[PDB]
Short mmCIF file of C-alpha atoms and ligand atoms in Angstrom, two decimals:
data_model
loop_
_atom_site.label_atom_id
_atom_site.label_comp_id
_atom_site.label_asym_id
_atom_site.label_seq_id
_atom_site.Cartn_x
_atom_site.Cartn_y
_atom_site.Cartn_z
CA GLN A 23 52.55 -1.46 15.98
CA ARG A 24 55.81 -1.23 14.03
CA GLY A 25 56.25 2.08 12.20
CA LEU A 26 57.17 2.69 8.61
CA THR A 27 57.07 5.30 5.91
CA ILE A 28 54.91 5.09 2.77
CA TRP A 29 56.53 7.56 0.38
CA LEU A 30 54.36 8.68 -2.53
CA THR A 31 56.15 10.28 -5.46
CA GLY A 32 54.79 11.49 -8.78
CA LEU A 33 53.89 14.53 -10.84
CA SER A 34 51.82 17.39 -9.57
CA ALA A 35 48.13 16.29 -9.95
CA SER A 36 49.07 12.62 -10.29
CA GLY A 37 46.71 12.01 -7.34
CA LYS A 38 49.15 11.54 -4.46
CA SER A 39 47.22 13.42 -1.79
CA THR A 40 43.89 11.90 -2.76
CA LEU A 41 45.44 8.49 -2.54
CA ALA A 42 47.10 9.30 0.80
CA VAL A 43 43.81 10.38 2.30
CA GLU A 44 42.06 7.15 1.34
CA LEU A 45 45.04 5.04 2.34
CA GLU A 46 45.15 6.66 5.80
CA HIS A 47 41.40 6.19 6.11
CA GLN A 48 41.56 2.48 5.38
CA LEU A 49 44.64 1.88 7.50
CA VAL A 50 43.21 3.54 10.57
CA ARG A 51 39.68 2.17 10.27
CA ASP A 52 40.26 -1.36 8.87
CA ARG A 53 43.62 -2.21 10.37
CA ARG A 54 43.48 -0.07 13.47
CA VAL A 55 46.97 1.35 13.08
CA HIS A 56 48.19 4.86 13.69
CA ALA A 57 49.01 6.81 10.55
CA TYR A 58 49.75 10.43 9.82
CA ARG A 59 49.98 12.27 6.50
CA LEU A 60 52.72 14.74 5.63
CA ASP A 61 51.76 16.81 2.59
CA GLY A 62 52.10 20.26 1.16
CA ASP A 63 49.44 21.67 3.39
CA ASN A 64 51.01 20.75 6.70
CA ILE A 65 54.65 20.97 5.72
CA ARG A 66 55.15 23.72 3.14
CA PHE A 67 53.28 26.36 5.14
CA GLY A 68 55.02 25.45 8.40
CA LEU A 69 58.29 23.58 8.79
CA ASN A 70 59.24 24.30 5.21
CA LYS A 71 57.62 27.69 4.72
CA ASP A 72 61.15 29.08 4.16
CA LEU A 73 61.56 26.98 1.02
CA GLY A 74 60.55 27.52 -2.57
CA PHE A 75 60.96 25.40 -5.68
CA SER A 76 64.58 25.86 -6.73
CA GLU A 77 66.48 22.61 -7.01
CA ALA A 78 68.31 23.42 -3.78
CA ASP A 79 65.08 24.19 -1.94
CA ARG A 80 63.52 20.95 -3.19
CA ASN A 81 66.57 19.05 -2.00
CA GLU A 82 66.09 20.67 1.44
CA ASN A 83 62.26 20.24 1.38
CA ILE A 84 62.66 16.50 0.89
CA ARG A 85 65.62 16.20 3.24
CA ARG A 86 63.59 17.66 6.09
CA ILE A 87 60.44 15.75 5.22
CA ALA A 88 62.36 12.47 5.20
CA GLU A 89 63.79 13.18 8.69
CA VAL A 90 60.29 14.04 9.95
CA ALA A 91 58.80 10.87 8.42
CA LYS A 92 61.53 8.89 10.11
CA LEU A 93 60.52 10.41 13.47
CA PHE A 94 56.89 9.37 12.90
CA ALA A 95 57.96 5.89 11.92
CA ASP A 96 60.24 5.71 14.96
CA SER A 97 57.23 6.74 17.08
CA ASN A 98 55.44 3.62 15.75
CA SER A 99 53.14 5.41 13.35
CA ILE A 100 52.86 4.91 9.60
CA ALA A 101 54.00 8.15 7.98
CA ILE A 102 52.39 8.72 4.56
CA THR A 103 54.16 11.40 2.55
CA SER A 104 52.79 13.07 -0.56
CA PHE A 105 55.41 15.21 -2.28
CA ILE A 106 56.44 15.28 -5.89
CA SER A 107 60.03 14.41 -4.73
CA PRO A 108 61.31 14.67 -8.28
CA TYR A 109 64.93 13.88 -7.67
CA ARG A 110 65.89 10.24 -7.35
CA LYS A 111 69.00 11.02 -5.30
CA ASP A 112 66.87 12.69 -2.62
CA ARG A 113 64.38 9.85 -2.53
CA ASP A 114 67.28 7.45 -2.18
CA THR A 115 68.76 9.53 0.64
CA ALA A 116 65.32 9.43 2.29
CA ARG A 117 65.19 5.64 1.86
CA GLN A 118 68.68 5.19 3.31
CA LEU A 119 67.86 7.38 6.28
CA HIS A 120 65.09 4.93 7.11
CA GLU A 121 66.72 1.62 6.15
CA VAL A 122 70.08 2.20 7.82
CA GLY A 130 65.97 0.06 10.36
CA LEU A 131 62.48 1.33 9.45
CA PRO A 132 60.64 0.14 6.28
CA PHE A 133 60.44 2.68 3.44
CA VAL A 134 57.72 1.83 0.94
CA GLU A 135 58.10 3.96 -2.17
CA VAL A 136 54.89 4.26 -4.12
CA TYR A 137 55.16 5.62 -7.63
CA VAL A 138 51.87 7.37 -8.31
CA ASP A 139 52.33 7.30 -12.06
CA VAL A 140 50.36 9.22 -14.60
CA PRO A 141 51.75 10.51 -17.91
CA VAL A 142 52.13 14.28 -18.11
CA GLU A 143 49.11 14.36 -20.44
CA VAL A 144 46.78 13.01 -17.83
CA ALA A 145 48.07 15.37 -15.09
CA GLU A 146 47.84 18.29 -17.52
CA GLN A 147 44.22 17.55 -18.35
CA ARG A 148 43.40 17.37 -14.62
CA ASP A 149 45.40 20.59 -13.81
CA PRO A 150 43.19 21.38 -10.81
CA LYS A 151 44.89 24.61 -9.90
CA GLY A 152 45.77 25.67 -13.43
CA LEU A 153 49.52 25.39 -12.75
CA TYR A 154 50.35 23.32 -15.84
CA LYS A 155 48.77 26.03 -18.00
CA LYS A 156 50.82 28.69 -16.17
CA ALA A 157 53.94 26.62 -16.66
CA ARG A 158 53.24 26.30 -20.40
CA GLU A 159 52.79 30.07 -20.55
CA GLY A 160 56.02 30.69 -18.68
CA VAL A 161 54.23 32.32 -15.74
CA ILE A 162 55.58 29.63 -13.42
CA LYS A 163 59.20 28.74 -14.04
CA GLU A 164 60.75 25.33 -13.44
CA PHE A 165 57.52 23.43 -13.13
CA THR A 166 57.92 19.68 -12.77
CA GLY A 167 57.09 17.80 -15.98
CA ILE A 168 57.01 20.94 -18.15
CA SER A 169 60.15 22.92 -17.36
CA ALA A 170 61.81 20.96 -14.55
CA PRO A 171 62.56 17.25 -14.26
CA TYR A 172 60.70 14.35 -12.79
CA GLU A 173 63.11 11.43 -12.27
CA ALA A 174 60.86 8.41 -12.13
CA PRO A 175 61.64 5.76 -9.53
CA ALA A 176 63.66 2.88 -10.83
CA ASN A 177 62.56 0.43 -8.21
CA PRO A 178 59.45 1.46 -6.37
CA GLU A 179 57.85 -1.07 -4.03
CA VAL A 180 54.45 -0.19 -5.55
CA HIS A 181 53.71 1.22 -8.98
CA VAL A 182 50.21 2.65 -9.31
CA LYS A 183 49.13 3.48 -12.88
CA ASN A 184 46.91 6.11 -11.40
CA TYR A 185 44.68 7.07 -14.30
CA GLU A 186 41.16 5.82 -15.19
CA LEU A 187 41.43 3.97 -11.92
CA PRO A 188 39.17 4.15 -8.83
CA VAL A 189 41.01 5.46 -5.82
CA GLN A 190 39.96 2.36 -3.91
CA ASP A 191 41.72 0.11 -6.44
CA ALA A 192 44.89 2.18 -6.07
CA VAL A 193 44.70 1.96 -2.27
CA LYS A 194 44.02 -1.77 -2.40
CA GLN A 195 47.12 -2.18 -4.47
CA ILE A 196 49.17 -0.47 -1.73
CA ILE A 197 47.56 -2.26 1.21
CA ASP A 198 47.98 -5.61 -0.55
CA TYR A 199 51.68 -4.90 -0.93
CA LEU A 200 52.03 -3.98 2.76
CA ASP A 201 50.40 -7.30 3.65
CA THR A 202 52.87 -9.35 1.57
CA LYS A 203 55.50 -7.91 3.88
CA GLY A 204 53.50 -8.40 7.06
CA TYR A 205 53.63 -4.73 7.97
CA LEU A 206 50.02 -4.59 9.11
CA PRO A 207 47.87 -6.26 11.79
CA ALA A 208 45.30 -8.70 10.44
CA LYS A 209 42.19 -7.06 8.98
CA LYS A 210 39.48 -6.35 11.57
CA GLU A 211 36.30 -8.46 11.40
CA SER B 2 39.32 33.35 10.83
CA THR B 3 39.70 35.58 13.91
CA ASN B 4 40.80 33.61 16.90
CA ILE B 5 39.71 34.00 20.47
CA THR B 6 40.68 32.25 23.72
CA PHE B 7 38.74 29.46 25.39
CA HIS B 8 37.92 31.86 28.21
CA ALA B 9 36.36 34.32 25.73
CA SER B 10 34.42 31.48 24.02
CA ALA B 11 31.80 30.78 26.66
CA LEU B 12 32.21 27.03 25.96
CA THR B 13 31.65 25.04 29.18
CA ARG B 14 34.17 22.78 30.86
CA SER B 15 32.85 19.65 29.10
CA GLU B 16 32.74 21.46 25.78
CA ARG B 17 36.25 22.86 26.12
CA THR B 18 37.83 19.63 27.08
CA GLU B 19 36.03 17.70 24.35
CA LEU B 20 37.19 20.13 21.69
CA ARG B 21 40.81 20.44 22.77
CA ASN B 22 41.19 16.72 23.40
CA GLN B 23 40.33 15.86 19.80
CA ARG B 24 44.02 15.88 18.95
CA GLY B 25 47.18 15.94 21.03
CA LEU B 26 49.34 18.60 22.64
CA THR B 27 52.92 19.63 23.22
CA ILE B 28 54.73 19.69 26.53
CA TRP B 29 57.63 22.07 25.97
CA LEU B 30 60.40 21.74 28.53
CA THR B 31 62.81 24.68 28.73
CA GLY B 32 65.79 25.28 31.01
CA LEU B 33 69.54 25.32 31.25
CA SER B 34 71.72 22.56 29.88
CA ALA B 35 71.64 19.81 32.50
CA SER B 36 68.67 21.26 34.33
CA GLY B 37 67.06 17.83 33.79
CA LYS B 38 64.71 18.30 30.85
CA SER B 39 65.32 15.02 29.08
CA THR B 40 65.27 13.14 32.40
CA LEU B 41 61.90 14.60 33.21
CA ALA B 42 60.70 13.88 29.67
CA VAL B 43 61.59 10.19 29.92
CA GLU B 44 59.84 9.81 33.25
CA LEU B 45 56.86 11.86 32.05
CA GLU B 46 56.50 9.68 28.93
CA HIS B 47 56.85 6.59 31.11
CA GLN B 48 54.07 7.62 33.47
CA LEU B 49 51.77 8.94 30.76
CA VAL B 50 52.04 5.83 28.62
CA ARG B 51 52.04 3.42 31.59
CA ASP B 52 49.37 4.90 33.85
CA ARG B 53 47.23 6.87 31.48
CA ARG B 54 47.65 4.86 28.32
CA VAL B 55 48.23 7.83 26.00
CA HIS B 56 50.60 8.08 23.03
CA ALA B 57 53.66 10.33 23.54
CA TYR B 58 56.87 10.94 21.67
CA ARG B 59 60.00 12.71 22.80
CA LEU B 60 61.95 15.19 20.71
CA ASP B 61 65.43 15.96 22.03
CA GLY B 62 68.93 16.77 20.88
CA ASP B 63 69.67 13.18 20.08
CA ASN B 64 66.83 12.70 17.60
CA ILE B 65 66.73 16.21 16.22
CA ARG B 66 70.20 17.80 16.17
CA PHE B 67 71.97 15.13 14.21
CA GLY B 68 69.15 14.67 11.68
CA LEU B 69 66.60 17.32 10.82
CA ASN B 70 68.75 20.02 12.42
CA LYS B 71 72.23 18.69 11.72
CA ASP B 72 72.81 21.83 9.59
CA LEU B 73 72.41 24.08 12.64
CA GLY B 74 74.87 25.19 15.30
CA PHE B 75 74.53 27.44 18.35
CA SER B 76 74.65 30.92 16.97
CA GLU B 77 71.61 32.95 17.99
CA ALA B 78 70.16 32.69 14.47
CA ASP B 79 70.74 28.92 14.39
CA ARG B 80 69.05 28.50 17.78
CA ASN B 81 66.06 30.55 16.50
CA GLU B 82 65.85 28.22 13.54
CA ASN B 83 66.45 25.08 15.64
CA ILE B 84 63.50 25.98 17.84
CA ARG B 85 61.26 27.08 14.98
CA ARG B 86 61.72 23.73 13.25
CA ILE B 87 61.29 21.73 16.43
CA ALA B 88 58.12 23.61 17.23
CA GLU B 89 56.72 22.81 13.81
CA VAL B 90 57.59 19.12 14.24
CA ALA B 91 56.08 19.00 17.75
CA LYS B 92 52.93 20.60 16.24
CA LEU B 93 52.75 17.75 13.67
CA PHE B 94 52.95 15.19 16.46
CA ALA B 95 50.27 17.05 18.47
CA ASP B 96 48.12 17.24 15.29
CA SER B 97 48.59 13.49 14.84
CA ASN B 98 47.04 12.93 18.25
CA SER B 99 50.13 12.25 20.26
CA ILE B 100 51.65 14.17 23.14
CA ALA B 101 54.90 15.66 21.92
CA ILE B 102 57.43 16.21 24.70
CA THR B 103 60.39 18.46 23.80
CA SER B 104 63.62 18.90 25.72
CA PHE B 105 65.57 21.83 24.30
CA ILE B 106 67.19 24.69 26.17
CA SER B 107 65.11 27.14 24.09
CA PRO B 108 66.80 30.09 25.80
CA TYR B 109 65.05 32.91 23.97
CA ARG B 110 61.65 34.04 25.02
CA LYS B 111 60.85 35.19 21.45
CA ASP B 112 61.42 31.68 20.11
CA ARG B 113 59.37 30.02 22.79
CA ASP B 114 56.63 32.56 22.01
CA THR B 115 56.88 31.72 18.29
CA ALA B 116 56.67 28.00 19.18
CA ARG B 117 53.61 28.65 21.34
CA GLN B 118 51.89 30.78 18.72
CA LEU B 119 52.22 28.25 15.94
CA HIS B 120 50.63 25.64 18.18
CA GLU B 121 47.89 27.78 19.64
CA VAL B 122 46.56 29.38 16.44
CA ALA B 123 43.40 27.90 14.98
CA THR B 124 44.35 27.91 11.30
CA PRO B 125 41.74 28.25 8.51
CA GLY B 126 39.81 24.98 8.29
CA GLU B 127 40.41 23.81 11.87
CA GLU B 128 38.28 25.20 14.70
CA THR B 129 40.94 25.10 17.39
CA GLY B 130 44.70 25.19 17.83
CA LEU B 131 46.73 22.69 19.84
CA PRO B 132 47.65 23.09 23.52
CA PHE B 133 51.21 24.14 24.33
CA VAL B 134 52.29 23.46 27.91
CA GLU B 135 55.50 25.27 28.73
CA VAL B 136 57.42 23.79 31.63
CA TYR B 137 60.31 25.76 33.09
CA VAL B 138 62.78 23.17 34.40
CA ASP B 139 64.53 25.53 36.81
CA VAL B 140 67.82 24.96 38.50
CA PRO B 141 70.51 27.45 39.51
CA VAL B 142 73.53 27.34 37.22
CA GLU B 143 75.63 26.02 40.13
CA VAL B 144 73.43 22.91 40.24
CA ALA B 145 73.66 22.38 36.46
CA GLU B 146 77.43 22.66 36.80
CA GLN B 147 77.45 19.76 39.23
CA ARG B 148 75.58 17.69 36.62
CA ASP B 149 78.30 18.04 33.99
CA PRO B 150 79.82 14.67 33.10
CA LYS B 151 80.90 15.92 29.70
CA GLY B 152 82.41 19.06 31.22
CA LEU B 153 80.51 21.43 28.97
CA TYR B 154 80.20 24.10 31.64
CA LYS B 155 83.90 23.61 32.33
CA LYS B 156 84.71 24.10 28.64
CA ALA B 157 82.40 27.12 28.59
CA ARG B 158 84.16 28.76 31.49
CA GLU B 159 87.52 28.06 29.80
CA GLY B 160 86.41 29.57 26.55
CA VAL B 161 86.54 26.31 24.59
CA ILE B 162 82.83 26.47 23.82
CA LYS B 163 81.73 29.99 23.00
CA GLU B 164 78.31 31.47 23.78
CA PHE B 165 77.28 28.76 26.18
CA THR B 166 73.89 29.26 27.80
CA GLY B 167 74.14 30.46 31.40
CA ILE B 168 77.87 31.24 31.22
CA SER B 169 78.45 33.30 28.08
CA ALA B 170 75.01 33.46 26.46
CA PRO B 171 71.71 34.14 28.16
CA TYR B 172 68.91 31.96 29.37
CA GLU B 173 65.72 34.10 29.42
CA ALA B 174 63.73 32.59 32.23
CA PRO B 175 60.05 31.96 31.51
CA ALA B 176 57.94 34.58 33.30
CA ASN B 177 54.62 32.76 32.92
CA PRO B 178 55.11 29.10 32.19
CA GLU B 179 52.23 26.68 32.69
CA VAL B 180 54.43 24.72 35.08
CA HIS B 181 57.49 25.88 36.97
CA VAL B 182 59.51 22.96 38.37
CA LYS B 183 62.43 23.70 40.71
CA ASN B 184 64.24 20.56 39.65
CA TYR B 185 66.77 20.19 42.39
CA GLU B 186 66.50 18.74 45.92
CA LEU B 187 63.40 17.11 44.43
CA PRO B 188 63.18 13.59 43.05
CA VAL B 189 62.21 13.40 39.37
CA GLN B 190 58.95 11.63 40.13
CA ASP B 191 57.86 14.67 42.14
CA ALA B 192 58.62 17.06 39.30
CA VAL B 193 56.72 14.82 36.93
CA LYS B 194 53.76 14.72 39.35
CA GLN B 195 53.73 18.51 39.23
CA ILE B 196 53.46 18.37 35.44
CA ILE B 197 50.83 15.61 35.37
CA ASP B 198 48.75 17.37 38.04
CA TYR B 199 48.73 20.46 35.84
CA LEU B 200 47.65 18.43 32.79
CA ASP B 201 44.80 16.99 34.83
CA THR B 202 43.59 20.48 35.90
CA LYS B 203 43.09 21.08 32.17
CA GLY B 204 41.49 17.69 31.63
CA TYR B 205 43.93 16.75 28.88
CA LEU B 206 44.40 13.17 30.04
CA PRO B 207 42.20 10.07 30.32
CA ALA B 208 41.04 9.51 33.90
CA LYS B 209 43.77 8.17 36.20
N1 ADP C 301 42.22 8.22 -9.50
C1 ADP C 301 41.92 9.46 -9.95
N2 ADP C 301 41.25 9.62 -11.15
C2 ADP C 301 40.91 10.84 -11.66
N3 ADP C 301 41.25 11.95 -10.94
C3 ADP C 301 41.92 11.86 -9.75
C4 ADP C 301 42.28 10.59 -9.21
N4 ADP C 301 42.91 10.82 -8.06
C5 ADP C 301 42.95 12.11 -7.85
N5 ADP C 301 42.35 12.76 -8.88
C6 ADP C 301 42.11 14.18 -9.16
O1 ADP C 301 43.33 14.76 -9.62
C7 ADP C 301 43.57 16.05 -9.02
C8 ADP C 301 44.90 16.02 -8.30
O2 ADP C 301 44.86 15.07 -7.22
P1 ADP C 301 45.81 15.34 -6.01
O3 ADP C 301 45.55 14.22 -5.09
O4 ADP C 301 45.65 16.68 -5.35
O5 ADP C 301 47.27 15.24 -6.72
P2 ADP C 301 48.77 15.46 -6.19
O6 ADP C 301 48.73 15.38 -4.63
O7 ADP C 301 49.61 14.39 -6.77
O8 ADP C 301 49.20 16.82 -6.63
C9 ADP C 301 42.34 16.31 -8.15
O9 ADP C 301 41.39 17.18 -8.82
C10 ADP C 301 41.77 14.94 -7.87
O10 ADP C 301 40.40 14.93 -7.44
N1 ADX C 302 57.66 25.04 -9.81
C1 ADX C 302 56.86 24.12 -9.31
N2 ADX C 302 57.01 22.78 -9.56
C2 ADX C 302 56.20 21.84 -9.05
N3 ADX C 302 55.15 22.08 -8.20
C3 ADX C 302 55.02 23.43 -7.97
C4 ADX C 302 55.77 24.46 -8.45
N4 ADX C 302 55.29 25.65 -7.98
C5 ADX C 302 54.27 25.34 -7.22
N5 ADX C 302 54.03 24.00 -7.14
C6 ADX C 302 52.97 23.42 -6.33
O1 ADX C 302 53.66 22.70 -5.24
C7 ADX C 302 53.36 21.22 -5.28
C8 ADX C 302 54.64 20.42 -5.22
O2 ADX C 302 55.25 20.61 -3.91
P1 ADX C 302 56.15 19.49 -3.35
O3 ADX C 302 55.46 18.15 -3.49
O4 ADX C 302 56.70 19.90 -2.00
O5 ADX C 302 57.40 19.57 -4.44
S1 ADX C 302 58.80 18.97 -4.30
O6 ADX C 302 59.32 18.97 -5.70
O7 ADX C 302 59.56 19.92 -3.46
O8 ADX C 302 58.65 17.63 -3.76
C9 ADX C 302 52.62 21.01 -6.67
O9 ADX C 302 51.67 20.02 -6.59
C10 ADX C 302 52.11 22.42 -6.98
O10 ADX C 302 50.79 22.65 -6.17
N1 ADX C 303 76.90 26.99 23.00
C1 ADX C 303 76.11 26.11 23.58
N2 ADX C 303 75.15 26.46 24.47
C2 ADX C 303 74.33 25.57 25.06
N3 ADX C 303 74.33 24.21 24.86
C3 ADX C 303 75.34 23.89 23.94
C4 ADX C 303 76.22 24.72 23.28
N4 ADX C 303 77.04 23.99 22.45
C5 ADX C 303 76.67 22.74 22.59
N5 ADX C 303 75.62 22.56 23.48
C6 ADX C 303 75.02 21.27 23.79
O1 ADX C 303 73.69 21.30 23.12
C7 ADX C 303 72.60 21.17 24.10
C8 ADX C 303 71.60 22.29 23.86
O2 ADX C 303 70.99 22.07 22.58
P1 ADX C 303 69.54 22.65 22.35
O3 ADX C 303 68.67 22.30 23.48
O4 ADX C 303 69.07 22.32 21.01
O5 ADX C 303 69.88 24.25 22.45
S1 ADX C 303 68.96 25.42 21.93
O6 ADX C 303 69.54 26.55 22.62
O7 ADX C 303 69.16 25.51 20.51
O8 ADX C 303 67.59 25.11 22.35
C9 ADX C 303 73.28 21.30 25.49
O9 ADX C 303 72.67 20.47 26.39
C10 ADX C 303 74.77 21.00 25.18
O10 ADX C 303 74.88 19.43 25.19
#
């Protein structure tokens, strides 16, 4: 198995983690590959527990996550990352770290702010509108959309399985996965 | 939720091994510069992958200190942070169901204890932590000094490299490591056998 990184980027509540979970599930079970998810839960309370949400801390959050994803890819696993990663320069630095190589598949999990705001599972968009949370991506901090993602998922009014199929189909056009199991 | 040890749990041997073998573990090598940690790690990975068919990945200065930890030096605070970050990365590999093998001096007992604790804790939502096997790769400093192609000990004694472990900074020897290897006047394969034999007493590996 050749490793690679599948880098999800998009607004808070765009559906990145949900997509990552289903993607990992299909990859492991249907293609028999090794995959591991890096997300807020296993990174921001551990390796990056010293970081907040200032621009500088987000630059460092992503810098570290990209180096860790590269280690997983180097280990021959598929690293699936699910972080807002709002700054294009940091995503490009992450891509270069891999390519200079290991494949880096950037997946833009795209929903308009309106859709994420109506989901608002943890009520953070409402807090951001009220000024309780400062510098909140999409409301009071920037989201720099990817210019050239390998996969662009219009992730609204869309079954998670259709979104995952879109990603797996892309990986197959590049031959990154073993043939599907019978 | 409140954690307890496997001993305190009353789970049987088959139950303990089944539960702790659901994911991976970390083999944490500690010892002086040039004590032989990375050498043992390469041979250990070779035997584990070859003879036992398990997945393992090595973390060492070459893949950590010029990437993730390129922002850190050798001050005490930077070594505390170097080890904290490595421990968290090794934990991710163990969580991913690989054997993480680390080869860092990790001179401070408090940092090795922090590394152990973050692995061993059963965090909310998981029922068990991840095993952490500390291996003291022990050689006298005189032996490490005879394994110094880059002359780091020489530079340390000359004052070119400040606070160098074993010469001008301390190495806090592990008091209770899982495995204590006296890695001199002993071929590497023998040291590795000592480590693998220990792993087998815990049942962490597929049958020989
Ligand atoms: N395709 C989808 N359609 C509608 N809701 C979704 C979809 N995918 C995820 N969600 C919902 O949106 C919320 C945010 O999803 P999540 O995966 O946690 O987002 P993110 O990781 O981008 O912050 C959740 O309540 C989730 O169940
Ligand atoms: N100011 C904030 N901006 C964006 N997300 C925030 C903020 N404060 C808390 N969060 C929470 O943290 C998650 C984003 O964390 P990351 O993906 O790690 O962000 S990133 O910008 O540094 O990539 C959101 O989904 C939300 O749960
Ligand atoms: N002051 C120093 N003390 C010990 N090793 C040093 C020092 N400066 C450079 N090194 C080099 O860095 C290696 C030790 O790096 P680490 O294992 O990452 O150290 S640790 O103390 O922070 O765990 C040594 O093998 C040596 O090549």
